[PDB]
């Protein structure tokens, strides 16, 4: 099916405590495969998957060099952005960056992203055509005229339509046994009493992959409920459940519907006492 | 692979 590779970067300033904190992680689909932490002892790019450890030493040398360049730019950016917003040197602030690319079922380029944020709010983002920027604030407007006069989208477009897709195909080829798998959810339902005149039914779905799933309740064929966020199970799979409170005796009217791409046909669960 | 460099704001 479709696949994607993403990179996340975070930088947090620490006034009166030395250098800022830098963290970088890389994800392929829903699986993490690299990480870099400035507070660690190695000061290197470390692998977090079995299929990525078969690369040579030049790969890791290049990765370390480039991530250090990222951190250097982010450390200048913290200062400049503090300058723009008329803020003092007492508080700690955050900058965040994200980019990546998507491929289709034929492993051909579909979309690319590149986004920037300051203190949890959008700052500037590359548009879908990979040639223009979207700046929703006056300071981003100042940045946007500099970036449009200097043709940064040219490097970004070349990278995203080239190297991103090529190495994503390479990674999907290497870690084929893990990255190109689907795990159907092992679903079941429980029942709990809610005093004299009510009960709660809980619909489960455990150990599926990837994280995209849909759990909906239906009473006699009409949509209605408590939903939790898809949570990581800790070993490469995910979990989720949904619950509804029903009047006592009417439990036979409700059904749970599960949709997942690891299933050929959507499953339907009914309460079986 | 990661980018070679990023441009400052």
């Amino acid at each position, epitope marked *: 099916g479709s696949h994607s590779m993403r990179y996340f970067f975070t930088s947090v300033s620490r006034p009166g405590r030395g250098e800022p904190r830098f963290i970088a992680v890389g994800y392929v689909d829903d699986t993490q495969f690299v990480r870099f932490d400035s507070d660690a002892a190695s000061q290197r790019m470390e692998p977090r998957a079995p299929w990525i450890e078969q690369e040579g030493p030049e790969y890791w040398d290049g990765e370390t060099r480039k991530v250090k360049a990222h951190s250097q730019t982010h450390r200048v950016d913290l200062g400049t952005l503090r300058g723009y917003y008329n803020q003092s040197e007492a508080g700690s602030h955050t900058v965040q960056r994200m980019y990546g690319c998507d491929v289709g079922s034929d492993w051909r380029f579909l979309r690319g992203y590149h986004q920037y944020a300051y203190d949890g709010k959008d700052y500037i983002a590359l548009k879908e055509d990979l040639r223009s920027w979207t700046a929703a604030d006056m300071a981003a407007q100042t940045t946007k005229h500099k970036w449009e006069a200097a043709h940064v989208a*040219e490097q970004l477009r070349a990278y995203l339509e080239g190297t991103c897709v090529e190495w994503l195909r390479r990674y999907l080829e290497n870690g084929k046994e893990t990255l190109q798998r689907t795990d159907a959810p092992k679903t079941h339902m429980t029942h709990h009493a809610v005093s004299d005149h009510e009960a709660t039914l809980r619909c489960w779905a455990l150990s599926f992959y990837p994280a995209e799933i849909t759990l909906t309740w239906q009473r006699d064929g009409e949509d209605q409920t408590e939903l939790v966020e898809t949570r990581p199970a800790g070993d490469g799979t995910f979990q989720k459940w949904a619950a509804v409170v029903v009047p006592s005796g009417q439990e036979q009217r409700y059904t749970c519907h599960v949709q997942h791409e690891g299933l050929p046909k959507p499953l339907t669960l009914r309460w079986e006492p | 692979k990661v980018l070679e460099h990023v441009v400052r704001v």
Partner: antibody, heavy 118, light 109 residues
Framework: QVQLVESGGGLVKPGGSLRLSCAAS????????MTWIRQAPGQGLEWVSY????????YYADSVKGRFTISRDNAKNSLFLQMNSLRVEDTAVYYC???????????WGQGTTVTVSS | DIQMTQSPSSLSASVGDRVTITCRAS??????LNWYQQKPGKAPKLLIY???SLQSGVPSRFSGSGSGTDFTLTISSLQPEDFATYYC??????????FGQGTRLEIKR
């Protein structure tokens, strides 16, 4: 280790032609813009040309417009400068400079000497 | 076409003194200023970028400050290997890229 290496500078006559080169190694050549800087004997640095990462935006200095031509080959990591209709005031030492990771130009070549005389 | 003007054009100092060089721009370059250093007969070398940030592998006695149109390079304690020529460059536009005219630093006796 990143580095650049120039070659091609020599002795030429006014109105002649020359072709310089700058071979890169140790980094991805197709993601940085490159420049040509020159320095006359006993003078200061002066910018000459510029070409973007993919090669779509090219700029020249007013003194060399219409006579020089810059280009690049991303597949072989090479940068060229074709100098035509040379004058005596074009005698200098030429450097190729790669852009910096944050600001400036932090990778320079070693320089090649060009002498124009009759 | 932004003109950069250094001052002075030459400055003599002794080992252990405090030095100060200035670079003046024709219009406002908010923080796009880099400083270089050239020993006689070799290629230049970046020292300061973004007008206040120190290049990796440069002794901490160098420092830069300033913004807008008036900038400064300061050396707290001269060493025998600090006598060279220094240039300032703007990164605010293109074309053209322009440098300062240079400032040579010599030994006093």
């Amino acid at each position: 280790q990143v580095q650049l290496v120039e070659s091609g500078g020599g002795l030429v006559k006014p109105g002649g032609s020359l072709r310089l080169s700058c071979a890169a190694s140790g980094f991805t050549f197709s993601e940085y813009y490159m420049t040509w800087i020159r320095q006359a004997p006993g003078q200061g640095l002066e910018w000459v040309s510029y070409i973007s990462s993919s090669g779509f935006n090219i700029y020249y200095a007013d003194s060399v417009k219409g006579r020089f031509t810059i280009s690049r080959d991303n597949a072989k990591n090479s940068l060229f400068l074709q100098m035509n209709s040379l004058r005596v005031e074009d005698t200098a030492v030429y450097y190729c400079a790669r852009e910096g990771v944050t600001d400036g130009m932090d990778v320079w070549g070693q320089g090649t000497t060009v002498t124009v005389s009759s | 076409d932004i003109q950069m003007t250094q001052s002075p054009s030459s400055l003599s100092a002794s080992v252990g003194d405090r030095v100060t060089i200035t670079c003046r721009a024709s219009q406002s370059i908010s923080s796009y200023l880099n400083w270089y250093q050239q020993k006689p007969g070799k290629a230049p070398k970046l020292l300061i970028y973004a007008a206040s940030s120190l290049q990796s592998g440069v002794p901490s006695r160098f420092s830069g400050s300033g913004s807008g149109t008036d900038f400064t390079l300061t050396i707290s304690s001269l060493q025998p290997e600090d006598f060279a020529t220094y240039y300032c460059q703007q990164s605010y536009s293109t074309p053209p890229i322009t440098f300062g005219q240079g400032t040579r630093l010599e030994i006093k006796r």
